Amino acid sequence: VLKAAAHHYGAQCDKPNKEFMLCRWEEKDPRRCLEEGKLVNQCALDFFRQ
Amino acid sequence: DGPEKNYEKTMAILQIEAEKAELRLKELEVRRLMRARGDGPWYQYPTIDKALIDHSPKTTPDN
């Protein structure tokens, strides 16, 4: 299911996903970007909701 | 030749040799300190060069 909608998911949810990746690639600690991970999941859910 | 010539020559030779002895003892002390502390130009054993490290973005975020 994810792979079928993978391309559209990346296009629609680019900004929240990219922000989270930047956080994990700068803070270098999963305990500092937990909230950013939440936003990615929420935005992913909205993508599938549409 | 005159005796004063040999007198002055002896004085000069004594000064040179004594300074050499002072320098030799000084060198031994300096060498011991450098080899016991590594804070001088001598006895600087090589360490890994930091230039080799690559800071480019890796695959996993937590390096």
Query: Positive or negative, the Cα torsion across B42, B46, B52, B53?
Result: negative
Chain A CB contacts of B63 below 8 Å: 28
- Are A8 and A47 a contacting pair, CB within 8 Å? yes
Helices (H), B1-63: 3-37
Q: Using DSSP, state whether B57 is helix, strand or coil.
A: coil
CB contact under 8 A, B62 and A21: no
3-state SS string over A37-49?
A: HHHHHHHHHHHHH
Helices (H), A1-50: 6-12, 14-26, 34-49
B40 φ/ψ sector (left φ>0, alpha ψ -120 to 50, else beta): beta
- Are A31 and A50 a contacting pair, CB within 8 Å? no
To one decimal, the resolution in angstroms is 3.2
User: Within a 10 A sphere around the Cβ of A36, how many other Cβ atoms?
Assistant: 17
